[PDB]
Design a protein around this ligand. Structure first.
Ligand SMILES: CNc1ncnc2c(Br)[nH]nc12
Length: 147
């Protein structure tokens, strides 16, 4: 048995990227940026957490068929930073720490559905879709165990 993930503090968000370049840059420099509304949502969650638990980011490139890894949010959002550092010319930056870098096919995860998103498969989420914690524990377990 593995009962590690089944912890009652933590918040988990889907991150969708159109760009494989942005993913590589994120892993290289441990930073990320979302849309304006995505940034606001992540920033609110990080600050309300007050270090009592992690904010996890589950990354997937749009259209790729797989998640590509897991990172923890590690700072609030800085909204006034150098423009143009990502593939398309994004307002701001925050720190992350990449945890897993591995491809996990959507087939491994499509059966987990999100009650807060019309019971759609977690694999059908938009950028910064939040994941209920009890579903997030199931997703993290499948990702950590995929080979
Ligand atoms: C740099 N950040 C991003 N890059 C590419 N696509 C994204 C979406 Br969709 N939301 N944030 C994104």
């Amino acid at each position: 048995e593995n009962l590690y993930f089944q912890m009652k503090h933590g918040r988990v968000f889907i991150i969708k990227s159109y760009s494989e370049d942005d993913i590589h840059r994120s892993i290289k420099y441990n930073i990320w940026c979302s849309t304006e509304h995505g940034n606001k949502r992540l920033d609110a969650a990080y600050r309300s957490m007050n270090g009592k638990g992690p904010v996890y980011l589950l990354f997937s490139v749009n259209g790729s068929g797989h998640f590509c890894g897991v990172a923890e949010m590690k700072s609030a959002v800085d909204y006034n930073t150098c423009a143009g550092v990502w593939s398309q010319d994004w307002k701001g930056r925050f720190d992350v720490r990449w945890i897993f870098v591995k491809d996990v096919p959507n087939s491994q995860l499509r059966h987990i559905r999100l009650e807060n998103n019309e019971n759609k498969p977690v694999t059908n989420s938009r950028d910064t879709q939040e994941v209920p914690l009890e579903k997030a524990k199931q997703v993290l377990k499948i990702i950590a165990s995929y080979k």
